[PDB]
Antibody, heavy 217, light 209 residues
Framework: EVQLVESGGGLVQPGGSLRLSCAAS????????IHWVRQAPGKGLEWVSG????????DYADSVKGRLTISRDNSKKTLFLEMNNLRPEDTAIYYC????????????????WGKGTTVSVSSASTKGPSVFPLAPGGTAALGCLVKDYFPEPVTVSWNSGALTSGVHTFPAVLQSSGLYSLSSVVTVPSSSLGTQTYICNVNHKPSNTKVDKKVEP | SFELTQPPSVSVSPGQTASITCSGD??????ASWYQQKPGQSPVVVIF???KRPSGVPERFSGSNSGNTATLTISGTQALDEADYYC?????????FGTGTKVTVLGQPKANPTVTLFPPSSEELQANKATLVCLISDFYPGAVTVAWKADGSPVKAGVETTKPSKQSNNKYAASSYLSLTPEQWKSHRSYSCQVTHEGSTVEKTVAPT
């Protein structure tokens, strides 16, 4: 019954603003300090801000001091985080966590956490990929480069679902540009090349993009 | 910000003792906490006030804060103890997390990566672009470094490398992409994707033809 639920995450342009909230259940919200902890994809935990049970004492990390404002309405059992002039570096999952005391005391810890809410700060816009054919004993590696697309995700099939066992579709990279690039490879007989036809089927539903790319050596 | 330094990675065999350290000048004067984060999940406290366990935490987890160094010990480490572990300390009212340690509980023999490197497609070259695609698969444990070379000279620009991700077979995969101009591509003898794992390096090379 004791839970924190974060809301308000989304995609935002750099320089934009976002308001995050955190709904508490199962305990007396006012009796406890609540903090925000963020984590950028693939990176470490980073403390963002904290607030006393009454809301009087507010504390902010150096990285966010001016741009962020933490507050709480105890009547609504909700915490808030106002984020302005968002930077790409603010891209992270934002977690709210409940301290074991009313304030940030010596040996206090975060006993309860929420599942978190995702913030993406990107200047990128919806864009379908450019699909390129990747070509070179008993086996041959053939591939499809799905380039410069936004946002996630993309689905890749081979020969319309006929080939799957020897197929490896790699997770996307997020480039500096804010665009994603993904690659799928299939293992096939080297003898069959020039006889057999290998087609990757790329679907990017966000852009309504379907591309069937024939891969030849 | 006082900085809490942790070793980035620890390997432990099932049943063995895993020692995770956390160092910093203001540590030891202050109390240390330890948070466990399993993949896809929120962090969970396992140790607080240097050596206390929250009621639900198993006894095999324990802590010590000698001098400038705090240590989390996991006795009889289980496969489910595999997680990122972070120390935390309170500087006045500022909370600081440590850099983090990846604890791998060895479930599997070591496996070096299969590396496949593809040159630029002719269609891409026709569009006045050039991407080298280096795909890394079936490596365990799940840590690699990628380096690109032009004619054996390091190339740091135009590189976008993913972080390793766990495959369904519990091995890991990763990708690296090198952006070049058609002109750059055609003006060098060779390009190489060099992947280092557990002290072994694999190199694949492609050339303009």
């Amino acid at each position: 019954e004791v839970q924190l639920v974060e809301s308000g995450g989304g995609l935002v342009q750099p320089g934009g603003s976002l308001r995050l909230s955190c709904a508490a259940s199962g305990f007396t919200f006012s009796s406890y300090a609540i903090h925000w902890v963020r984590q950028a994809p693939g990176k470490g935990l980073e403390w963002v801000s904290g607030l006393s049970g009454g809301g009087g004492d507010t504390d902010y990390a150096d990285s966010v001091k001016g741009r962020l404002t933490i507050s709480r309405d105890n009547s609504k059992k909700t915490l808030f985080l106002e984020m302005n002039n968002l930077r790409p570096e603010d891209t992270a999952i934002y977690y709210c966590a409940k301290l074991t005391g009313y304030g940030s005391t010596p040996g206090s810890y975060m006993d309860v956490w929420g599942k978190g809410t995702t913030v993406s700060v990107s200047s990128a816009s919806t864009k379908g990929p450019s699909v390129f054919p990747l070509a070179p004993g008993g086996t041959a590696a053939l591939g499809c480069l799905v380039k410069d697309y936004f946002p996630e995700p993309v689905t890749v099939s081979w020969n319309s679902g006929a080939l799957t066992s020897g197929v490896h579709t790699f997770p996307a990279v997020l480039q500096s540009s804010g665009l994603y690039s993904l690659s799928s490879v299939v293992t096939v007989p080297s003898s069959s090349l020039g006889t057999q036809t290998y087609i990757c089927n790329v679907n990017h539903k966000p852009s309504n993009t379907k591309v069937d790319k024939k891969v030849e050596p | 910000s006082f900085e809490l330094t942790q070793p980035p990675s620890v390997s432990v065999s099932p049943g063995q003792t895993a020692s995770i350290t956390c160092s910093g000048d203001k540590l030891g004067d202050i109390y240390a906490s330890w948070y466990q984060q399993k993949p896809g999940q929120s962090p969970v406290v396992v140790i607080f006030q240097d050596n206390k366990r929250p009621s639900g935490v198993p006894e095999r987890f324990s802590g010590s804060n000698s001098g400038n160094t705090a240590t989390l010990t996991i006795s009889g480490t289980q496969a489910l103890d595999e997680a990122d572990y972070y120390c935390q300390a309170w500087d006045t009212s500022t909370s600081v997390f440590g850099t983090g340690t990846k604890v791998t509980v060895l479930g599997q023999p070591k496996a070096n990566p299969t590396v496949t490197l593809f040159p630029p497609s002719s269609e891409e070259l026709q569009a006045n672009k050039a991407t080298l695609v280096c795909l890394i698969s079936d490596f365990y444990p799940g840590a690699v470094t990628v380096a690109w070379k032009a004619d054996g000279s390091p190339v740091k620009a135009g590189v976008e490398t993913t972080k390793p991700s766990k495959q369904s077979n519990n091995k890991y995969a990763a990708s690296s992409y090198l952006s070049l101009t058609p002109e750059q591509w055609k003006s060098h003898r060779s390009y190489s994707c060099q992947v280092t794992h557990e002290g072994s390096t694999v190199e694949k090379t492609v050339a303009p033809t």
